[PDB]
Symmetry: C4
């Protein structure tokens, strides 16, 4: 008596343009066992993307829906790379007959400013431990270090490979048939008069080529026709009431770490150090919550906010509440730090994690100002009080910042050593600010298992018991 129409608009996120990963996944799953829904339509024309892990996860639920025997259809005029990824999960893909399958690969590109700085006479002070902690490089050079390019080439090549393999599996062709490279996609388009849909069909990226309204045909064939709507029977994700789970009364707390780790209360699309700790603390203190899932998708951020979060989490574990980390997309640097006290860590193969390293920057403009004839002066009871963007950074402060940074790396490899049943010398080998795919992190001991949020929740329940429901924060 309907299709579920996944006309997703905007983007996939962990916690709200913005769509909840879990709501999609849960909605699909509900639809699977819903007698009123007979199949799924993907309309991805206002879908800007998501991270690879999260889109894999929707890939999974889509596949479960397929296996119960209700069909899943993919229909657009064109497909963006991000869009095609999600659409490769359908039984049948329709693309328009002049439309495109836009596959190009991944690129990582960042701006560097040493020259501008020097030109502007800025004084730049870098404090760091990590050969591969490369977010610092924009201040100190014109380009990437060989080190940085090794680390990046590795994870880029890997995520892209995963893309290709996941799409290959899904379309039952070999990977370089999905994307043979620029030289081949170009030859292949040449044997096709530059027909992009025609290449897309002879190489099996796509199933049939069809107008919007002769698609409207095949769709009313399948799911029927409504006259109340004058369009094939169906209902949008945005409309379909995702039913509210039964209260067991005995739950698993789900805490989010979405975005960058800042110091205050939560503002923006950022992790507020103090907010998260409060949520974790609420979990620990509530006798109904029996285990915690820290769901992490964070580039990293403030060290001290990281430690505030970690220490609440440790507390929960020490109070005999098990802690399991679901990394989705990124759990890096401070994102790993916060993950460190977990009983178990699980990552997607395409998750970016690691980047166990540390850094601070300090810029001052004393020469900048000098050159246009501005100057500072004052009286200080200590050089340590003369630390402001308009004053040279004093040596005394330089030396203890270095020292503080060093201590920080130590604290970091030490937490990881203790948490991962390892030694500091061993952690140092897989640290140095090096970023790792989920897969690399599993190989080197940083993460316990490859999987997704389902695996995280299952393991949480395992470490206690029974018949659970989820308290989201």
């Amino acid at each position: 008596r309907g299709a579920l129409l996944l006309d997703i608009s905007g983007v996939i996120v962990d916690k709200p343009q913005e769509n909840s990963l879990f709501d999609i996944v849960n909605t699909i799953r509900q639809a699977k066992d819903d007698r009123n829904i007979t199949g799924i339509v993907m309309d991805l024309k206002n879908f800007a993307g998501g991270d690879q892990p999260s889109m894999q996860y929707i890939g999974k639920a889509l596949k479960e829906f397929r296996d119960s025997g209700k069909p899943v259809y993919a229909v657009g005029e064109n497909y963006s790379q991000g869009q095609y990824y999600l659409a490769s999960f359908a039984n049948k893909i329709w693309l328009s007959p002049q439309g495109v399958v836009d596959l190009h690969g991944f690129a990582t590109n960042g701006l560097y400013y040493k020259s501008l700085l020097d030109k502007l006479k800025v004084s730049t002070h870098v404090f760091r431990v990590g050969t591969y902690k490369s977010a610092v490089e924009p201040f100190i050079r014109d380009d990437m270090s060989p080190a940085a390019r090794e680390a990046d080439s590795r994870w880029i090549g890997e995520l892209w490979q995963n893309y290709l393999n996941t799409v290959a599996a899904n379309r039952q062709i070999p990977a370089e048939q999905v994307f043979p490279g620029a030289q081949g996609l170009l030859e292949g388009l040449t044997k096709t008069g530059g027909d992009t849909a025609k290449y897309a069909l002879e190489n099996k990226l796509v199933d049939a080529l069809a107008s919007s309204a002769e698609i409207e045909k095949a769709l009313t064939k399948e799911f029927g026709w409504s006259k109340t709507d004058k369009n094939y029977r169906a209902i949008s994700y945005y409309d379909y009431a995702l039913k509210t789970p039964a209260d067991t009364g005995d739950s698993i707390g789900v805490v989010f770490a979405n975005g960058a780790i800042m110091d205050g209360e939560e503002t923006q699309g950022n992790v507020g150090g103090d907010t998260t700790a409060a949520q974790i603390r609420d979990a620990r203190l509530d006798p109904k919550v029996k285990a915690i899932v820290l769901r992490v998708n964070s580039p990293g951020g403030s060290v001290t906010a990281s430690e505030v979060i970690r220490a609440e989490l440790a507390a929960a574990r020490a109070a005999g509440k098990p802690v399991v980390v679901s990394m989705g997309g990124m759990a890096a640097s401070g994102g790993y730090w916060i993950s460190t006290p977990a009983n178990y860590i699980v990552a997607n193969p395409s998750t970016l994690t690691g980047s166990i390293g540390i850094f601070g920057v300090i810029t001052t403009v004393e020469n900048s100002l000098d050159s246009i004839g501005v100057h500072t002066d004052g009286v200080s009871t200590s050089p340590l009080a003369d630390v402001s963007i308009t004053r040279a950074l004093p040596p005394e402060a330089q030396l203890m910042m270095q020292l503080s940074i060093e201590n920080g790396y130590k604290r970091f490899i030490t937490l990881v050593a203790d948490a991962r049943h390892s030694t500091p010398e061993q952690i140092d080998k897989i640290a140095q600010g090096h970023v790792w795919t989920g897969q690399d992190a599993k190989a080197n001991g940083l993460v316990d298992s490859l999987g997704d949020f389902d695996d995280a929740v299952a393991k949480a329940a395992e470490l206690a018991k029974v018949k659970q429901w989820h308290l989201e924060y």
Copy 2:
């Protein structure tokens, strides 16, 4: 009883300071057969203009009203070139004794930036098919191309000519007496000591000089005087109750393509593919709607958005509903595209149409940033992925856009040749970007007849049957 006061303020647009072309026409027409209305008075002081075809279509309703032997008067301190066109349609034109009828001709003005972009070190990539697709020119030249100036002179000459011929006819004086050229007008104004008013009266642009108050007297003699309003007997267009036509059970549905063609939905004062497609779809499916008139005033836009709109309109035709295009100011590039599936296209001779061609522009600033000491680095899994505003556009990427354009052309000239009972080689001979007046377009087979909305509507009712009303979208 009273006068109709056409105190138009703002602009004339197809569909909403803004005033509905159609509401004006039909109000005049209603007032023609209203015993209560005894003449029209046009006061165009706050009116900033409309395009030539629209104001001509207002002219038409004025002539009809006039022909019922009710009088039409234009009063004012001065007339701008736009204001004067419209008033020239009146039986009698009052000009203030030191006022001016400001005829100066038509021009076209654009900025060109090749040298600026070169100085700023901007890399500019132009992808095109069409010698006469000139809007791309500001990025790659300092003046206009030979080509451009021929296409642009053709239509501009024609339109101005159409202006003069309309005004001459309306004033019963030769076109060269309405506008003698810069030199003649100097001569004529010299003979007058710079009394532009006396020039207007002696060359018959105008029928009487008089102040606001003397004008009052003569309009109150003509329409009587309202003890109650303390002014001559008259109602304002804005307060005049335009009857809402009766509901027969047979409709011609009017859909408006007004503005630039965008991918989203109805935005700003643009056209949204999806909204317009949906309107067309509503009409196509509603059994009351017997034919469709796509009203078009569009410079063009997004190819894909054009296609979403074409398909629907072609769907409607296939389903038995006659489709008629009313071109009303502009219908060019995407404006033509969306018109293509029509059974019948009618244009004003003054419409601007055609411009069958295609272009994309990319600018990258890699050298721009380089000279200020700012640089970019990354890793990519394919040169195809490495495409953004701060990086050099990879050859591989260039080749792919070239093709995508060389091939949207093919798409374009194929549509036109199918809809106009012609061939690809033939259409090329008159496409290649070149914009055409409605009259050149009729002459080369792009447009079926020269007329206006009336004529459009007429053809629609004829290609079905009977006793219509209009449904608007």
Copy 3:
């Protein structure tokens, strides 16, 4: 009830609307004059930003009429700006702080001149003008003022300053050169006191007594007595003091304000709208009740077309048999004189700034500024007259049309003034050429009928008709 009227004017004085009604202050003072419960005036000008000299003199007239009835008028302040003191000087008695200043320093005009900047930016500047004294144009075309412009500006400014000094000298009853002795004298006089400005003021009679804000509070309570309720000497502020609503006769004189620069549309900002004002003029034209019109002008000018629009209605009212009297206050120059043309009678303050019979237009273009950064314009036209844009060179054809337009406007202007003033275009020319005139010169050369103020306009307006009036102010 029983106490001072407290003139704690905060802000500017203006014809219309921080903003205060000229007419409201005067009429209020006037009512305080015959109000038995008001026994005096106290002026507290500390938050007073100023008014045009004619206005403050008008206010002064009303303060004198008040003094003359036997009620005292006192001025109090820590200091007096030049503006404040002018009004303060009309008091019986002026109290100043023991360390305060009377800040008298003269009048000055000052403007920016850009010729070189425009040259350096490669801007093209096109000035069309008839009037050797029409100086608004000079910024675009000199790096300084012209000798001519300087003569006109010197005459009027030297004159208004003289008038300031004579009013105040008379108000204080000491010679003008004692009111302000020039800078050398001021410096010398002030050195003698060791730089005490308050003692300079007391000794040179600009001020009557020295006092702190509390001893002043003592002196005023000893005069108006004390209000156990308001915890102050008995008074009521201008802002709280209730203005009796004039009764209506049934025979009004309409009052219309042309206050500000003259623009084309509806009234906006604090500016005149051609159409708005004319509508009001037309409105009184057709109210049977309204028997004459005073046009109250305070305007540097504006759009020529909008001036005409106001002038034509004004003329129409007159042809309708209503007399029209212009009342100039501060300025009524250029457009603002033009709108005065059709009156049976024009009255100015001696310090009014009027005249400026002249005309101009200015066109800047940037084709060379843009050529230098590598921008250009190009296109097609059915006639050079259609290529007139900020970004394009001004075409010779348009250039000629403009020169003819401005000459034609000048002849328009000097011709309306000829017919209105009983003179000839060649006579008017001799006293036009864009020259600004004090009300005083406007009087000697014919542009104005008499020297006076709003009272005189209104009285004349009633004189050309009948008996007993009241005002309809078209503060619409």
Copy 4:
């Protein structure tokens, strides 16, 4: 149970008067005093993580309440991950300070930092005019030097040296360790941290800056042992300062009026977060005329401002004194220049040893841009009845007008040192030897007669009551 800790989870800055984030110095001190005698408050916990500082005199005043609190046998605990310098000052008054196992107590000293731009103005062709009396009236140097003068350096060194030394001696006393172990200078700190491998918490704990190292969860276990557990609130039994009903005092009908001069002194009515001559004057005025008001305390925290606003206020205060109501000034933070001027008329001036005051001196600055304009080809012209009227930013400042300002500065300087000399039983010639714009700590002020005694608000209120009579309450003119 229903007994708990007071939580001084202060957020923002401490100010004399909150100005519609800002907490009232007086509400804080008064709540702690109430809490002291409240059987329902069993201790205090300072959580000072979102506390942004307050001036030294004001924060000491809070310390004194804190101490009275402690001296009645209730504990006072300070907790946090870190301590900024301003936070540690207050933290230090606690019986016991917790810090996170890797946190920092961030001590670094006091510094003054200003911009000097004589070279910019010369580049930009600007014309600077400086009119002054006072060698140490230094706020004028940025326009004319590219660095501070030796005079300015001597003066600012004397006072910043002094206030820091006070920071140290207070915090030292509070902790019971020598002053040079609260902060052994930068070398000392570097040496300490080298020993410690860069561990800021070990350094703090070993040198006794702090008592325990703990995470928040641990600190909580501790505070709930000490105050009990609210099963109700799910936390250690406590109430936040922001929720504690500060009782309003029983009304007498014999009152001491409190007037706040808080901020820079401007000529209008009260604007911004500034003092307006007229509003303060008027509040002084009500107090003069209320028979209920028996004395006035002027609470001053001001670097100064407008000469003529200052005088307006001074005059009203004089009036109050002379009408028979004593005037006592409590300076807290600054009361300098105009801040001193307005204080002059008082019976008694009390100041914190760390108050900044003095700065008897005077200055005006005129900058003109006629040559800046001239060089982008912009110019000014006009006509004038006298060069005195020819004074704006785009014109050269005429010699005549210069002579007049120079004369005006010289005069207002005499007015100043005379005001002071009459007020403080001295002479102009004597006051000159300690004016010349020289700013002075409350302590140096005492030494030279500008101030009657070192102390705080309590000491001003007391002195005011003592200048008339009896039992009393305060009217605070606020809003």
